[PDB]
C-alpha cells in the first residue's frame, strides 16, 4: 500500500483488543502510546521532543497490530496527545519513505540547502510543519507559537522560503526555534512528492 502525506498519517492500531488511533512517525525513534495499562514489567525512561522531555514507562515485547501487520517490540507509555508509531515498529512492518526509496532502520536525515547553507534535517511524517534550529533567514517573519511538551514554544514563521531537499525544490513555510533536531514536516514533504509505503 501507499499512504499520502496531505493529511496526518493516522492509522488505527490494536493492542490486546484495545483499538487506538496512532500517527506514523518517521521522526520518532520509538513508539509512544497514550496512557494505558499494559501487562508486564516496565522501567521509567525520559524521551525528548520539541518543548523538552516527558517521563514514560518502557514495556518490551508488546504486540501491536498495524494495518494488518504484527509488530512486536518496545512501547513507551506516557502522557502523549497522539499515539506515535516510531521507527522501531515501522521498520518491522516494512514501511519506507518514497518519492527513490528511504528505509527507516536509521534516522532519515538528509542534507538540505536553505539560504545558501547546507544543514542536516530529519524527514518527519509526524510533523505538520518544518522547524529549524536558530538561524537567520531573509524576509518578514511573524511570531508564532507551536505546541510542544509542557506547553507552547515560541518560533519565528517565515513564508515562501526556498528549500532544496534530496534534489527537489520546495518553496514554503519554515519555522525557526528551539527544536532538538531540524525537521522537515509534511508541508514540505508533500511538495517534494514523498509518500509512506510498505
Amino acid at each position: 500500500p501507499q499512504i499520502t502525506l496531505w493529511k496526518r498519517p493516522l492509522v488505527t492500531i490494536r493492542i490486546g483488543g484495545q483499538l487506538k488511533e496512532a500517527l506514523l512517525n518517521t521522526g520518532s525513534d520509538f513508539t509512544v502510546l497514550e496512557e494505558m495499562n499494559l501487562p508486564g514489567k516496565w522501567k521509567p525512561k525520559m524521551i525528548r521532543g520539541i518543548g523538552g522531555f516527558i517521563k514514560v514507562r518502557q514495556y518490551d515485547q508488546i504486540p501491536v497490530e498495524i494495518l494488518g501487520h504484527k509488530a512486536i517490540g518496545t512501547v513507551l507509555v506516557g502522557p502523549t496527545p497522539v499515539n506515535i508509531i516510531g521507527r522501531n515498529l515501522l521498520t518491522q512492518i516494512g514501511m519506507t519513505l518514497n518519492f527513490p526509496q528511504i528505509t527507516l532502520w536509521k534516522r532519515p536525515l538528509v542534507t538540505i540547502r536553505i539560504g545558501g547553507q547546507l544543514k542536516e534535517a530529519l524527514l518527519n511524517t509526524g510533523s505538520d510543519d518544518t522547524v529549524l534550529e536558530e538561524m537567520n533567514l531573509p524576509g518578514k517573519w511573524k511570531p508564532k507559537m507551536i505546541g510542544g511538551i509542557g506547553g507552547f514554544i515560541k518560533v519565528r514563521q517565515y513564508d515562501q522560503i526556498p528549500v532544496e531537499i534530496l534534489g527537489h525544490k520546495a518553496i514554503g513555510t519554515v519555522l525557526v526555534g528551539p527544536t532538538p533536531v531540524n525537521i522537515i514536516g509534511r508541508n514540505l514533504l508533500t511538495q517534494i512528492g514523498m509518500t509512506l509505503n510498505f
Binding site: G27, S28, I47, T80, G86, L122, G126, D129, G147
Partner: peptide, 7 residues
C-alpha cells in the same frame, strides 16, 4: 529516544 511530533 528522540520522538519528534508537531501539530
Amino acid at each position: 529516544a528522540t520522538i519528534m511530533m508537531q501539530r
